[PDB]
Symmetry: D2
Subunit: 268 residues, 4 copies
């Protein structure tokens, strides 16, 4: 099943879409500057791009870390991003009451992994009728995603993206099961699957030392996921991977994606 | 560090405290019946007791599933439990705005495991000044519980209980690392550690074996659910065993 | 099901049996001294005791680490232990050809975890007719132990002990699933289940070994398997006092 | 570091090599038939090929299960495969005494994962001087492969292949950590790394293809694989391998 996002077609048989941006919105000027870097690199390669940021992030690593400019100013920033660059945008919500006003502006709304079973939020997000990105909790098996999808369907919204972010592996933070992508596609009606490679490399479960040198293998992880035929890649980059590297990185991802997406799926 | 909850002393070198009750509040009358059973059993066995129930199941599998009586009616039920039996109670909170009104009634308020990183919720719970029960996420290493404890300390509340509920073990399965208890005690200032045996068994006579094993490591409390979950009529027999072990362990000097 | 090992009764409802000793037989005099310390302490506390050591350790940290005294001299050392102290002994085997000569001397023979699905070794061990200790591999689940037990039964030997040593948990780490003991008892005919606390900790000390040991023994087990040099040898008495306390309590109550 | 196996170059920047065949050798005729199929498919696609089989099934579910032809007859069959098809072969060894006679015939000898810490087996395999395929244990972090490599080096054999076969994930289940390939390359001197997709897989056809594609995207020396399913698979794997190998390393 494909999802149309303005001009973009998002789907597991379509050219991959890049989701990226900044962690939290600070100001119009800082946002436009960072967005412009992604837009310039993606335009150089012809890759569809959706800008991501949080306006009120409730799960930062300290309780006084800045949560973002907030709903009213955040939406004004997102409006300007859409107008200036002509791209769609994506943000997370965590309060049911925020869903409707966010959905007036933001093309895709995101269901934080920790909240993925929270019924009042699921309903409120569903009722917006917007595209929704469902983050797969690290503690949920891929064959359980169908239950979250079922709740969205019960609440009347089928425009759903499934977002892989890794699975809990010992006290070693996260491992990504490359088979989980296929399990999701098969059980959830071939909804668009996207791969959050950045959060798959998170180390808040066990601390950074428990991940050893393994996180340096991030291009590899991205390539490996995209080899399984995916609608998109969710990826953070700042001058997260560095920006001199972003073009080189996307060249490799686009090469693989183009190769994969050009071949018919295996005969049956 | 010990925590006083009314007349109860909760701590890792004190007689274990039972946090027991039910999944979800469904009516006044069923709640009082179940709680009466727990009170009568625990009083005769001499086991300190805190009554547990959720007022809302916020993450059931269908949007049409029964969620329980809800906040307003749930607090009325908890007020009646406290009046009738004179015991403390515990319930979970899911939204920052629920924290102050829940804390006015419920002695202990509980941070759900999946919400343990929600900073707005941590702050709102902390501000209540109530005793807090921190459910350890299945995806968190025991040496990282300190990170949650640090947030509560920064928010000005140190009356914290650490609650084991198992660790993810592959897909759809949990294991309880019996060494984690000691890791939590050493790295979190010997705050009370309690064991949620019920949720640790998320896919028998297995509950007793697992409870015994956890309590062998010397813990402040046991957290469990029954249904009229352990069959309610087996409660007394179950607790006799747990108390026999707890008494023995607690009588041995710490090494 | 109980197993008699000389005058010892091993079983999940009997007083726990300590299986203790050392990693690798490296000498005669030092072996006897260490064994003597275990004997003195277990006799003082009334705890049944079986001395454990490897004669050939195929597991070493370097290619030229000493592998141990070997079969012939190792069996001689075991003979001396048995003559001097009058206790049973246990050791591991790695090759079918070693089964007979080791079984003639040793009261229990051990199947290494890595070899637990090696059919030729299983058959050769079964055919000795000796008591066998089956080490549960860290990569095998507790409900698969019944398949190893079946192979021994097909080969004619039912005098089997199941030994827990933890399960793989992420990378380079072990966790002991306290529920596995019950799964093994239920699916394998209530054969004796013992807990190798030493090897269950090898990726993680004294206070840890105690907590883990107590936790396991709370589940009602036939025995505890440990190495010293590994627990410091002088702390053996204190450690066993606490284990025996819990074991006596548990074992004195009927099963629920 | 590349390894030459006859006229095959095996390395992490070379065209991938297919290791495949059958589980356990049962007869000459069925072995030659299966091998001929792999040869015909790999030749027409231009993929280097090494034939794999065990002479013995060391783990069977019953004591009375069929065990395979055994060492003596197994080596006679491997000799005939090499004479008929002119390809290298690979088999596993389980006992030190088997190492020298197997190495006389088999180009690559394999260290089973469960036996990777058996020091006497390592030494005996090293002393053959043959190319060795080291199967990574399901509990070991990829950085710990360096400790096994060190042992082989100290025993005088540097012709080593590291082989991924998945990692234990709870009970009775495996996961392949796609980050581990790079870790093994970086910590073990860029020895060839190959991916045992068959044993990593605790329809199922489509799963094997997804997993194989994902691992080969990390840039590997080779792969193990068990109406024309082999060729359809290989066509896709070769397409991806060729693309990956044509990009400079980042
Ligand atoms: Cl903080
Ligand atoms: Cl998560
Ligand atoms: Cl709960
Ligand atoms: Cl959890
Ligand atoms: Cl041992
Ligand atoms: Cl093992
Ligand atoms: Na004997």
């Amino acid at each position: 099943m494909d999802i149309k996002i303005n001009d973009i077609t998002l789907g597991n048989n379509s050219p991959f879409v890049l989701f990226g941006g900044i962690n939290v919105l600070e100001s119009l000027d800082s946002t436009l500057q960072t967005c412009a870097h992604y837009v310039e690199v993606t335009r150089k390669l012809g890759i569809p791009y959706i800008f991501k940021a949080s306006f009120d992030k409730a799960n930062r690593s300290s309780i006084h870390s800045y949560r973002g400019v907030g709903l009213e100013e955040g939406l004004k920033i997102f409006e300007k991003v859409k107008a200036e660059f002509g791209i769609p945008v994506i943000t997370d919500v965590h309060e049911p009451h925020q869903c409707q006003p966010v959905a007036e502006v933001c093309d895709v709304i995101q269901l934080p992994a920790r909240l993925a079973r929270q019924t009042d939020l699921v309903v409120a997000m569903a009722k917006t009728g917007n595209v929704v990105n469902i983050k797969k909790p690290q503690f949920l098996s891929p064959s359980q995603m169908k239950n979250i999808v079922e709740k969205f369907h019960e609440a009347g919204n089928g425009k759903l993206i499934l977002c892989e972010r890794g699975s809990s592996f010992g006290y070693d933070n996260l491992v990504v099961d490359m088979l989980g992508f296929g399990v999701m596609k098969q059980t959830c009606g071939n909804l668009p699957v996207i791969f959050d490679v950045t959060h798959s490399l998170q180390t808040r479960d066990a601390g950074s030392a428990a991940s050893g040198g393994r996180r340096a293998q991030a291009l590899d992880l991205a390539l490996a996921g995209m080899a399984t035929r995916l609608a998109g890649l969710f990826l953070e980059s700042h001058p997260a991977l560095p920006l001199h590297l972003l073009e080189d990185f996307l060249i490799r991802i686009k090469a693989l994606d183009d190769l994969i997406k050009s071949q018919p799926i295996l005969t049956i």
